[PDB]
Design a protein around this motif. Structure first.
Motif, mmCIF file in Angstrom:
data_model
loop_
_atom_site.group_PDB
_atom_site.id
_atom_site.type_symbol
_atom_site.label_atom_id
_atom_site.label_comp_id
_atom_site.label_asym_id
_atom_site.label_seq_id
_atom_site.Cartn_x
_atom_site.Cartn_y
_atom_site.Cartn_z
ATOM 1 N N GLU A 75 -15.580 -7.763 9.369
ATOM 2 C CA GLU A 75 -17.038 -7.737 9.473
ATOM 3 C C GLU A 75 -17.497 -8.304 10.813
ATOM 4 N N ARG A 95 -17.637 -4.086 -4.030
ATOM 5 C CA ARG A 95 -16.720 -5.177 -4.334
ATOM 6 C C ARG A 95 -16.884 -5.674 -5.760
ATOM 7 N N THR A 149 -9.142 -3.368 6.323
ATOM 8 C CA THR A 149 -8.527 -4.689 6.261
ATOM 9 C C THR A 149 -7.141 -4.632 5.640
ATOM 10 N N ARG A 171 -6.420 -0.480 -12.117
ATOM 11 C CA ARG A 171 -6.164 -1.848 -12.548
ATOM 12 C C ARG A 171 -6.415 -2.021 -14.035
ATOM 13 N N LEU A 206 -12.739 4.498 -3.049
ATOM 14 C CA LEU A 206 -11.398 3.978 -3.285
ATOM 15 C C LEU A 206 -11.419 2.751 -4.188
ATOM 16 N N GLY A 254 -9.927 0.958 3.344
ATOM 17 C CA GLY A 254 -8.600 0.440 3.593
ATOM 18 C C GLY A 254 -8.396 -0.279 4.908
ATOM 19 N N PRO A 280 -17.016 3.680 6.864
ATOM 20 C CA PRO A 280 -17.794 3.214 5.711
ATOM 21 C C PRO A 280 -17.081 2.104 4.960
ATOM 22 N N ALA A 281 -17.657 1.665 3.847
ATOM 23 C CA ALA A 281 -17.087 0.563 3.090
ATOM 24 C C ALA A 281 -15.976 1.054 2.176
ATOM 25 N N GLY A 282 -14.975 0.203 1.973
ATOM 26 C CA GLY A 282 -13.893 0.495 1.056
ATOM 27 C C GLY A 282 -13.032 1.678 1.437
ATOM 28 N N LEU A 327 0.826 -1.195 0.000
ATOM 29 C CA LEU A 327 0.000 0.000 0.000
ATOM 30 C C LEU A 327 0.864 1.250 0.000
ATOM 31 N N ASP A 336 -13.263 -9.689 -2.346
ATOM 32 C CA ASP A 336 -12.209 -8.685 -2.331
ATOM 33 C C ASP A 336 -10.843 -9.339 -2.526
ATOM 34 N N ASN A 366 -18.290 -2.301 10.224
ATOM 35 C CA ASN A 366 -19.034 -1.244 9.547
ATOM 36 C C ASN A 366 -20.232 -0.840 10.392
#
Ligand SMILES: Nc1ncnc2c1ncn2[C@@H]1O[C@H](COP(=O)(O)OP(=O)(O)OP(=O)(O)O)[C@@H](O)[C@H]1O
Ligand SMILES: Nc1ncnc2c1ncn2[C@@H]1O[C@H](COP(=O)(O)OP(=O)(O)OP(=O)(O)O)[C@@H](O)[C@H]1O
Ligand SMILES: Nc1ncnc2c1ncn2[C@@H]1O[C@H](COP(=O)(O)OP(=O)(O)OP(=O)(O)O)[C@@H](O)[C@H]1O
Ligand SMILES: [Mg+2]
Ligand SMILES: [Mg+2]
Lengths: 384, 67, 1095
Positions: C340, C695, C294, C469, C461, C292, C288-290, C260, C657, C390
């Motif tokens: 989660e 995802r 994890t 990608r 993100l 970083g 929130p989701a996404g 990262l 993911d 979350n």
């Protein structure tokens, strides 16, 4: 807290309105009325005691007006230690709101009583079987037992605890529930002494409580941290103005900040303490981690900049000043001096605005609503 | 006590039987019993269809449910 | 056979031995029993062990053998690590005995690599030569140590410019060396450039510091790498400092993972994690989701020389499952992250608090043993627990405070996308990284601000990372410039937009940014021709979008209205891919909500602690094993054709993911191969959380992909395929479908009132199928009549089909009105369709003359199967039988007591081709009841197929009150979805055994009351679009009196002297019925319901 104030006011009225004369009843009743925004008009003061109440009401010191009844009449308070000490029962129930827990108070009490504590959360059948076995053993060999979140196992509570409490000396049993959870069986509740856990609503009271649980720079830093914790916790209660949301700060943040301060002092012997590093760490990692907004992070940063400025003479609140330690003192002398500084302080009636550096008008609405609820409820109770 | 009881009653009244009770090897036990009883009455029913259709007819004739 | 039974009866008894086998090598806790048996068995082969290194470790792919001696290991990315000393293998050595040796030998090898790499680098050696000698981890650690030392030296003074220029020269040298290096060296250099850019940022920040105090404060916040010079224990000679605290490097092999970019949020999170681990607490990330969470936890683990073990929490993780996972991670000594963590039940969250607190206390006081789950296990002093959660999403509970107080929380609400994009572009080779990254971020903000407020628009993100990608394989065909970025943006973001949002996207792309696929479109057209579709512009565009999305994303969501073109789209695209590439396609379609979660994934037999695979787990395991080598060169598609329930779907969060791992309650870790793609076919996104929308790449169907003309053409060319007659018949029928005449009919049908409303686009299937079947059924009598008569009969049949397919769900008034329009829009020269037109054996007649006068016996009124033939009864029986014979599902709707069961039973009574299986649906019906009702009527014949017991008669399911079954908390019905699966896919999965059963000769009809009645529930149009719908209203009062006069005549045959009074009795009865219905309505009492059944 609110029902504490309501009970204090109502019992004071029930006693005085019989013991005192009739004009006293008229005066106190119209005081309560103007507090409740039902009737308006100056009381026909001739006594001396009601003068202070009138001063509080006219200057819009609503919280002080509410606390006036308790301060004047009742001359004692009970904490959890007093309740456990001065009770003939063996079962206690401690209730709280969500977002706040008080098992650490019970652990402190167990250490102070040289007992043994077994913390048993109730979520599943294995924990229930373990609890049954532990209760059976502890009713014979003594020892304390704490059951956590008993509302997760209501069926077991309604059968086994009901039958058991319904039917040794050093054996005590505690049970923690939630004030907003499901209803508990009333017969079971009545067999146990009930306590509601919550933080101290004052500011000097919080500092005194935190200070009474603890080189010289360690003592100075602990005193500063106690003041900071009290100030920030008091500020958290003003959800539109003190902060932008409702946060919660507890003993864990205090412990982590204290440990960080000890590490900084120990590993940096120069006594050129990096007050900037301490400020940033406490504002971001220890107390700022919970904070997700940016304005509230700024608020915490401002408070840290004020308290941990690292100056020789610091006016922590508009009233008192704290001289930083000398180079020729002992820890006991420092404790004595700081305890004296704490003792001599007197909390003004406008603490929420003068001590938190906030505009008085914003605090006025919150205090007014808080007093209005209590006064209206007391009027409702007193007409029956 | 539970909604499943009412569901069983719904099945019993709507149809003339509860298929959940009779299956697996219980179906074969019921088939043997029906063969025996039907022979005892001198009726010639061989296929499983006739057997069970007689079963449900008897149930429809000889069952009254009062709520 | 029976030998397998003898093996099984002892296999269960071995579990108590396997559990104590895991106590010797604790990493066995990550392996299933079936793999433990194989590992123990392979005493001499030693090759079964090398297949499991990924499960046990994570970063190791295989062992390197050389004549019964361990030589080294191979990382997942292909890197090779050579052990310091080879491990000599003996036959008597058990697996654990040499595994435990290898585990320490890997650490020693990594330390030796680091030591001599650092020694070489301290002698003025440049970074651009050591990259060809040692593993990436050693170079990383040595470079960090030297950077720390040199920055401290420069901190002793105020001079930073010289070291900054040296760092810049090193960065430029590595960037230039990147181009001329092999794949492994390319990965090494790409991973190193991230840390070198971090070094440059830190040194520049120090350079800009005004005073010494500010520089010291800034230095105290970043990670420092030191090295003790006194200890003789090598494995503990390196520690890491940040904000005063210290942690120990572990010298465990990590490989060459994706690294990262160092952002301020990442470093502050590192500080919080260090602060929490100092006191042996847990670490918590929320937001929130996404954002970083994890991935930053994993990066923190990587920087401390250890691989973080990631579990995907779920409601199926009960108390014992979580406690066993804790026992495993505490015995191993690993860093477990419970992603989660909110998804657990509240009770289990309360229950595991004591275990977590016990772990913390044991770590703090340095205990040797910890008693979780009835046995005293050792406690490794290297363990740590992390949770990421979350708050405030659907299907998630709240941590109790006694548990929250066991972690330290950190908020990660908003990452810095600009820095990430700029650094990734710079590494990737783009010439103008800064301006490009700023433009991308600004454009994403503009999209999030100006576009419509659709519930599924996320541009966070994950979207940026997907865009990046898509740039790597596009540089060759578009060049490292703005063009590649713009085309990748179109490739990733456009397929998710609506109609106006597409125009907004184009305008913003034009304002912000300045500015060959024939081989695949030919394959697409060939596939469409094979399957008979028409390649219009919308269909081709959607196909191309799907093709380009799946090129890089392993999970796609296909959202659109019912019957809009999703299944055809992805089937056509995968067929075209198979043609283009030559790779075989293996497709599994799973109707998600039909199965329970235990059947979908698995369930422990708690009486034995024995794992039983679910359907998806079985498929994944069978693919991963790959016994026959079949799945080597295939693409595997798993289609989840159902609703997107959060609780069913977020159990695959780790699958979707970057982890690419399915985590099971027993600890198993099944990898996801690159040729294993997952599809989500659905019709709405109402309850789906942003955790799963971000995802998966999303493909939005704003409108139908087809026109009515092309759909009709496809339907006709499909119906013909199921049949010299054909050449003439095709011409005749295709001529009689004149779309110029048909479009007016189709648009006029929209003004009618339809019960159980279904779009006109969805009734064309019924129309075409019924018309073709009716025309075919008369083919014997087509040889001997003129052109005019043939045209007339075909026109009449098609008019009847249109009438009963477009207006069949409307009242007789509406049907009579619609017949006029049908007649007028075909022209008045053609044969006229009347209310009761019919074909007789050939002449045209009417149902009116076909009414048979009936005379019942007195005792025949008690028989429940006596139907008095009227015009409506005959007409309804005829149409119902015609629809049934056409192999099309039927639903009959009407008020209670209309007679739906009466017509159904009467039509099927006089037939020798069908049987009836009466099934009753109530408020609480399961698919088990449906399968139970078929047990005595069907056979299981083998793949697996289900057939009627008879060999001649087909089977018909009388499924009544299909409105009744209740919706779950997410607005779905099990039973209706099961019926949809039965009609559409003609099969279902046998849940306990994971096999596909094919339905052979079973038809499905339904009966229901209008959905306005109390307790009736709306139906998914994905289900009703497969069935022809007929409405069946109350008979008129005149019809009722005519019906019941016959009953009264039959009764009064017993009392002949009063036979003259039959008419007044019937009139009085029907009048009483009408008056009772009028007065005592349901507005007074709920049960005041009257019908002809009372008559
Ligand atoms: N600093 C970073 N540099 C590069 N890529 C990053 C960085 N931080 C996050 N990412 C990438 O962004 C995405 C973040 O996904 P991640 O799983 O970390 O989020 P999450 O918070 O776990 O989300 P969820 O709550 O839905 O599980 C991944 O693609 C990750 O690789
Ligand atoms: N390009 C096309 N040309 C001709 N007919 C088409 C075309 N695309 C779709 N159709 C028709 O549309 C019908 C709708 O079925 P489709 O597989 O598209 O359903 P869907 O989009 O998966 O919706 P759902 O599965 O929710 O019912 C198909 O049976 C087919 O006859
Ligand atoms: N032509 C007719 N001949 C005989 N009975 C008739 C006729 N028309 C109506 N009926 C009466 O109407 C009733 C229809 O009841 P039936 O159960 O068939 O209705 P349904 O539409 O299935 O309603 P439900 O929703 O309750 O199933 C019967 O009692 C039947 O005798
Ligand atoms: Mg995550
Ligand atoms: Mg479909």
């Amino acid at each position: 807290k609110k029902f504490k104030m309501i009970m204090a006011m109502t019992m004071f009225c029930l006693y005085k309105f019989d013991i005192e004369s009739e004009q006293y009843k008229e005066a106190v009743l119209t005081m309560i009325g103007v507090l409740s925004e039902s009737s308006d008009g100056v009381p026909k003061l001739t006594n001396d005691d009601l003068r202070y109440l009138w001063d509080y009401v006219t200057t819009k010191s609503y919280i002080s007006a509410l606390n006036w009844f308790k301060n004047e009449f009742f001359v004692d308070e009970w904490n959890i230690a007093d309740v456990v000490a001065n009770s003939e029962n063996n079962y206690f129930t401690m209730a709280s709101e969500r977002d706040v827990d008080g098992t650490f108070k019970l652990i402190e009490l167990a250490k102070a009583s040289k007992e043994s504590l077994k913390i048993i959360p109730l979520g599943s059948i294995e924990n229930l079987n373990y609890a049954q076995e532990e209760i059976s053993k502890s009713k014979i060999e003594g020892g304390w037992i704490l059951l956590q979140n008993i509302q997760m196992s209501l069926s077991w509570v309604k059968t086994y605890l009901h039958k058991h409490v319904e039917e040794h000396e050093k054996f005590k049993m505690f049970m923690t529930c939630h004030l907003t959870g499901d209803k508990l069986p009333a017969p079971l509740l009545q067999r146990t002494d009930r306590v509601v856990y919550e933080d101290i609503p004052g500011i000097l009271d919080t500092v005194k409580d935190l200070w009474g649980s603890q080189g010289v720079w360690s003592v100075y830093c602990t005193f500063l941290l106690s003041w900071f914790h009290a100030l920030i916790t008091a500020r958290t209660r003003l959800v539109p103005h003190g902060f932008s949301k409702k946060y919660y700060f507890n003993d864990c943040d205090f412990q982590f900040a204290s440990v960080y301060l000890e590490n900084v002092l120990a590993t940096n012997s120069t006594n050129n303490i990096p007050w900037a590093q301490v400020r940033d760490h406490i504002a971001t990692i220890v107390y700022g981690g919970k904070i997700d907004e940016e304005k509230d992070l700024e608020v915490v940063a401002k408070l840290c900049a004020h308290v941990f400025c690292g100056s020789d003479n610091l006016q922590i609140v508009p009233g008192v000043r704290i001289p930083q330690p000398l180079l020729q003192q002992s820890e006991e002398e420092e404790r004595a001096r700081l305890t004296a500084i704490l003792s001599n302080t007197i909390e003004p009636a406008d603490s929420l605005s003068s001590w938190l550096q906030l505009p008085r008008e914003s605090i006025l609405d919150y205090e007014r609503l808080q007093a209005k609820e209590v006064a209206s409820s007391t009027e409702q109770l007193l007409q029956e | 006590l539970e909604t499943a009881f009412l569901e069983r009653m719904n099945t019993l009244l709507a149809n003339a039987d509860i298929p959940d009770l009779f299956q697996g090897e219980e179906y074969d036990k019921l088939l043997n019993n029906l063969r025996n009883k039907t022979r005892s009455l001198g009726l010639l029913l061989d296929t499983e269809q006739e057997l069970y259709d007689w079963f449900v007819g008897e149930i429809a004739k000889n069952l009254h449910v009062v709520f | 056979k029976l030998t397998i039974d003898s093996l099984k009866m002892i296999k269960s008894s071995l579990s108590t031995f396997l559990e104590r086998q895991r106590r010797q090598f604790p990493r066995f806790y990550f392996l299933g029993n079936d793999d433990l048996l194989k590992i123990i068995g392979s005493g001499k082969h030693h090759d079964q062990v090398s297949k499991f290194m990924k499960k046990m470790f994570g970063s190791i792919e295989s062992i390197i053998f050389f004549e019964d001696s361990i030589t080294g290991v191979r990382s997942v990315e292909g890197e090779v690590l050579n052990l310091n000393e080879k491990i000599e293998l003996k036959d008597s050595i058990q697996a654990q005995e040499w595994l435990n040796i290898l585990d320490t030998e890997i650490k020693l090898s990594v330390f030796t690599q680091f030591r001599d790499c650092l020694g070489q680098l301290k002698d003025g050696t440049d970074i651009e030569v050591v990259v060809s000698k040692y593993i990436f981890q050693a170079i990383l650690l040595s470079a960090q140590v030297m950077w720390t030392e040199l920055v401290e030296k420069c901190l002793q003074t105020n001079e930073f410019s010289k070291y900054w220029k040296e760092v810049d020269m090193k960065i430029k040298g590595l960037l230039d060396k990147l181009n001329k290096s092999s794949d492994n060296v390319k990965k090494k250099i790409e991973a190193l450039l991230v840390e070198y850019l971090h070094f440059n940022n830190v040194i520049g920040q120090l350079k800009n510091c005004s005073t010494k105090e500010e520089a010291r404060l800034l230095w105290a916040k970043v990670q420092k790498f030191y090295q003790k010079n006194d200890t003789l224990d090598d494995l503990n000679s390196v520690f890491i400092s940040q904000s005063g605290y210290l942690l120990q490097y572990k010298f465990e092999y990590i490989g060459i993972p994706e690294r990262l970019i160092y952002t301020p949020l990442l470093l502050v999170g590192f500080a919080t994690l260090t602060d929490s681990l100092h006191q042996k607490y847990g670490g918590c990330f929320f937001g929130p989701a996404g954002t970083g969470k994890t991935e930053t936890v994993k990066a923190f683990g990587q920087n401390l020389g250890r691989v973080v073990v990631v579990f995907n929490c779920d409601d199926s993780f009960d108390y014992q499952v979580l406690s066993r996972l804790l026992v495993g991670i505490t015995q191993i000594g690993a860093w477990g992250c419970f992603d989660e963590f909110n998804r657990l039940d509240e009770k289990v969250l309360s229950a595991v608090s004591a275990n977590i607190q016990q772990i913390q206390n044991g770590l703090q006081v340095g205990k040797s043993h910890i008693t979780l789950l009835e046995e005293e296990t050792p406690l490794s002093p290297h363990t740590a627990v992390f949770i990421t959660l979350n708050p405030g999403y659907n299907g998630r509970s709240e941590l109790p405070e006694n548990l929250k107080k066991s972690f330290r929380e950190f908020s990660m609400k908003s990452p810095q996308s600009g820095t990430i994009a700029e650094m990734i572009l710079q590494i990737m080779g783009f010439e103008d990284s800064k301006s490009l990254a700023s433009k991308i971020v600004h454009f994403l903000e503009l999209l999030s601000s100006k576009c419509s407020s659709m519930n599924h628009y996320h541009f966070g993100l994950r979207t940026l990372k997907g865009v990046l990608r898509n740039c790597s394989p596009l540089v060759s065909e578009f060049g490292e410039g703005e063009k590649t970025v713009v085309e990748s943006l179109k490739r990733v973001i456009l397929p998710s937009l609506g109609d106006t949002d597409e125009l907004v996207f184009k305008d913003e792309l034009s304002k912000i940014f300045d500015s060959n696929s024939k081989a695949i479109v030919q394959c697409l057209k060939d596939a469409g021709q094979r399957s008979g579709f028409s390649m219009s512009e919308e269909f081709l565009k959607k196909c191309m979008q799907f093709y380009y999305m799946q090129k890089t994303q392993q999970a796609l969501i296909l959202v659109g209205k019912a019957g809009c073109g999703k299944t055809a789209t992805w089937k056509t695209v995968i067929d075209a891919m198979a043609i283009f590439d030559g790779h075989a396609n293996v497709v599994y379609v799973i109707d998600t909500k039909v199965l329970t979660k235990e059947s979908l994934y698995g369930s422990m037999l708690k009486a034995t602690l024995e794992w039983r695979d679910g359907l998806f787990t079985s498929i994944l395991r069978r693919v991963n094993d790959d016994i026959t080598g079949t799945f080597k060169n295939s693409r595997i598609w798993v289609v989840f054709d159902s609703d997107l329930d959060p609780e069913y779907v977020e159990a695959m969060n780790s699958v979707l993911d970057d982890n690419k791992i399915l985590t099971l309650p027993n600890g198993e870790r099944l990898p996801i191969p690159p040729n294993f793609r997952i599809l989500f076919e659905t019709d709405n996104l109402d309850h789906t959380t942003p955790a799963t929308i971000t995802r998966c790449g999303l493909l939005w169907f704003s409108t139908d992909v087809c026109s009515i003309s092309s759909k009709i053409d496809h339907l006709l060319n499909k119906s013909y395929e199921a049949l010299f007659e054909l050449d003439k018949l095709k011409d005749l029928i295709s001529d009689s479908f004149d779309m110029a005449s048909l479009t007016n009919i189709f648009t006029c049908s929209n003004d009618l009132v339809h019960i159980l409303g279904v779009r006109t686009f969805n009734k064309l299937e019924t129309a075409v199928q019924l018309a073709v079947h009716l025309i075919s059924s008369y083919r014997q009598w087509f040889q001997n009549l003129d052109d005019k008569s043939l045209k007339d009969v075909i026109t009449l049949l098609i008019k009847r089909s249109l009438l009963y397919a477009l207006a069949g769900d409307s009242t007789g008034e509406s049907q009579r009105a619609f017949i006029q329009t049908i007649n007028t829009y075909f022209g008045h020269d053609s044969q006229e369709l009347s209310d009761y037109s019919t074909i007789v054996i050939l002449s045209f007649s009417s149902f009116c003359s076909e009414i048979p006068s009936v005379s019942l016996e007195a005792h025949e009124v008690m028989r429940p199967d006596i139907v008095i033939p009227t015009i409506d009864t005959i007409k309804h029986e005829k149409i119902f039988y015609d629809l049934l014979n056409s192999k099309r599902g039927i639903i009959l709707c009407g008020p209670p007591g209309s007679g739906k069961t009466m017509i159904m039973n009467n039509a099927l009574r006089n037939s020798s081709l069908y049987d009836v299986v009466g099934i009753n649906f109530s408020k609480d019906t399961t698919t088990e009841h449906i399968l139970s009702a078929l047990h005595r009527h069907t056979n299981y014949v083998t793949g697996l197929t289900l057939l009627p017991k008879s060999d001649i008669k087909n089977l018909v399911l009388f499924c009544d009150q299909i409105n009744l079954p209740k919706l779950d908390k997410y607005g779905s019905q099990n039973v209706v979805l099961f019926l949809r699966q039965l009609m559409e896919k003609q099969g279902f999965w046998k849940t306990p055994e994971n096999k596909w059963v094919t339905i052979e000769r079973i038809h499905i009809v339904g009966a229901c009351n209008p959905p306005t009645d109390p307790g009736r529930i709306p139906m998914s149009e994905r289900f009703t679009r497969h069935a022809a719908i007929l409405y069946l209203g109350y008979p008129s009062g005149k019809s009722l009196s005519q019906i019941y006069e016959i009953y009264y005549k039959a009764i009064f045959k017993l009392v002949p002297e009063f036979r003259s009074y039959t008419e007044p009795f019937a009139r009085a009865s029907v009048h009483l019925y009408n008056e009772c219905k009028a007065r005592y309505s349901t507005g007074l009492q709920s049960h005041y319901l009257f019908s002809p059944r009372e008559l």
